[PDB]
Amino acid sequence: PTHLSVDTKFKTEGLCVDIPGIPKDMTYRRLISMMGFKMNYQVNGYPNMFITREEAIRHVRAWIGFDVEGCHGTNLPLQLGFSTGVNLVAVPTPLMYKGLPWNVVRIKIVQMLSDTLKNLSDRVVFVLWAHGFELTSMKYFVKIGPERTCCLCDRRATCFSTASDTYACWHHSIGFDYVYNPFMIDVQQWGFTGNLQSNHDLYCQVHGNAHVASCDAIMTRCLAVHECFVKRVDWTIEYPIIGDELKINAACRKVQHMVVKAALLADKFPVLHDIGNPKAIKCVPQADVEWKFYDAQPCSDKAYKIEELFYSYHSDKFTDGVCLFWNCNVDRYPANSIVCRFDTRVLSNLNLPGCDGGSLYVNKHAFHTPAFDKSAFVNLKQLPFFYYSDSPCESHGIDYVPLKSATCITRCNLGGAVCRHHANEYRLYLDAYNMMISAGFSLWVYKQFDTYNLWNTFT
Numbered sequence: 001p002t003h004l005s006v007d008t009k010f011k012t013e014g015l016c017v018d019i020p021g022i023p024k025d026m027t028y029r030r031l032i033s034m035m036g037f038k039m040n041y042q043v044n045g046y047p048n049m050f051i052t053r054e055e056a057i058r059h060v061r062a063w064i065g066f067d068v069e070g071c072h073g074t075n076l077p078l079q080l081g082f083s084t085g086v087n088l089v090a091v092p093t094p095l096m097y098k099g100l101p102w103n104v105v106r107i108k109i110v111q112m113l114s115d116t117l118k119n120l121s122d123r124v125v126f127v128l129w130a131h132g133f134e135l136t137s138m139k140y141f142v143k144i145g146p147e148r149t150c151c152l153c154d155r156r157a158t159c160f161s162t163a164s165d166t167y168a169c170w171h172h173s174i175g176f177d178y179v180y181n182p183f184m185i186d187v188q189q190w191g192f193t194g195n196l197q198s199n200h201d202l203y204c205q206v207h208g209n210a211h212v213a214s215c216d217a218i219m220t221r222c223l224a225v226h227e228c229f230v231k232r233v234d235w236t237i238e239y240p241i242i243g244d245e246l247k248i249n250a251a252c253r254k255v256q257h258m259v260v261k262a263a264l265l266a267d268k269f270p271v272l273h274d275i276g277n278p279k280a281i282k283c284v285p286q287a288d289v290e291w292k293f294y295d296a297q298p299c300s301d302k303a304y305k306i307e308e309l310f311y312s313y314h315s316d317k318f319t320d321g322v323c324l325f326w327n328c329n330v331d332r333y334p335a336n337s338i339v340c341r342f343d344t345r346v347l348s349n350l351n352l353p354g355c356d357g358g359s360l361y362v363n364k365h366a367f368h369t370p371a372f373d374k375s376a377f378v379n380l381k382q383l384p385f386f387y388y389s390d391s392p393c394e395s396h397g398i399d400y401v402p403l404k405s406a407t408c409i410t411r412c413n414l415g416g417a418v419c420r421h422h423a424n425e426y427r428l429y430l431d432a433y434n435m436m437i438s439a440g441f442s443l444w445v446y447k448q449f450d451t452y453n454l455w456n457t458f459t
Ligand SMILES: CCC(C)(C)NC(=O)c1cc(C)n[nH]1
Pocket: 248, 249, 250, 252, 253, 256, 326, 327, 363
C-alpha cells in the first residue's frame, strides 16, 4: 500500500458541470482512459497518474496548482492557470498571455515547469480542484509511458521532445515540448463542502480571487498546504537534501552558541528561560546561569500569544533574567529576549509559498511558519554582527592576509593585532552568519545588549 490503486473510486460530482452526464461510479482507471491516455497494463514505475495525499506530502516541493477555465471544449479557447502566477490562452484553431495554438503553448509549459522545479524536485505534482476542463486539457501537453532517465544525466525524465524523440529531466529540457509522466492530485477528493473560494477563504486572506485561472491555481495549492501542513503536521517525514541544508543547520547552531554565550557574559543574567523545542539542549553548556526549559512545538498556524505561553500560573517570573526564543514564534516578544525568527518573505529553494502569508520551510522536515511580522519585535532591536572568543591565541596545524575588524572581540584584537587563529575563526564565523541570514533567519536582542561589555571579560 504505497501507490494509489487505479481501481480506487473517484467522485465525479465536481466534474459534471464541464462534463454533463459523467457516471457517478468512476475509477481512476476509467478517468485516465476518458482523459485520452492509455496505461497498457504496464508495470514500469508509473502505476497511476494520480497519487495519494501521503505521496503528495512527500513531494510537496513538486506541487504546482493548475486550473483551466473556459474563455468562451474543442471549439473554445481555454485559459490555463498555474500557481506560478502564469495564465496562458490556448486556442484550438498575474501574467496574462494572448491566445496561441497548443503546439506552442506546450513549449512554454515545459520551460515554465522546468525553470520553477529544476532546483526543487525530480517531478511535478499538479494540484487540482478538478471541474473537468483541466483533466481534458492534459492530452494536449502531457505524454505518459514507462519511467525513464534523462538523455544527458542520471535523473528521472520529466519532459519529452517530439523533435528529437528523446527524454530529459528539468535541467536538460530546453526546446522540449511535452511534460512526461507528471503526477496529480484532486483536492476535491478529500471531502469538502462548497466551492474552492469558500474553503480557501476560511484560512487565508492573502490570496484574492481576481476571477482568473492562476488565482484559482494559487488558492488550490494554498488550500492543499493548509490541509497537509497547517491543520495536520508530520515532523517524521524526511525530505531530501537539495541545497545548503547542512551548512545552514550547522551555521544556526554556531550562531546560537555565540549569541547566547555573549549575552550571558555581557549582562550576567542569573536565569535563562529557554522557550521552544521540547528536545532543546543547553546551547552554552559551560555557562553558570540557571537554565530553565519550557516546551512549545513550532507553531504552524498563528504565532503563539505571549499571554498563553507565560500566564495561567515554572520559574513564573519570566521578567527575571533573559528569555531565549530560538525559532519559537510569538506575537510580541518581551523586552528581556534573545530571538531567532524565520522571515517567511525570504526567496530560496528551501522556502516554499505558504498559507495566509506564512511559508513552508523545507529543510530535512517541513515546517509551515506564520507570516513574518515586524511588530513582534517592538521591544527589541536587531542584533548586530560580532564575533567573540575567549579561546587561546594559538594557530595549530589556507593562505593569509591580516584581519582588521572592530567586531572581532578577542584578547589579540584588544591587544592591538588579531592573531592568525582568531582571524581564521572570525572569517569562518562570518561565513556561517551570512549563510544563516541569507537563508531567511533574523536575529533580535534586548535593547541594552552592547558588545562593548565583552572587552572586560579578558583580564
Ligand atoms: C539544533 C540547534 C538549533 C540552533 C536550535 N537549531 C535550529 O534552530 C535550526 C534551524 C535550522 C534551519 N537548522 N537548525
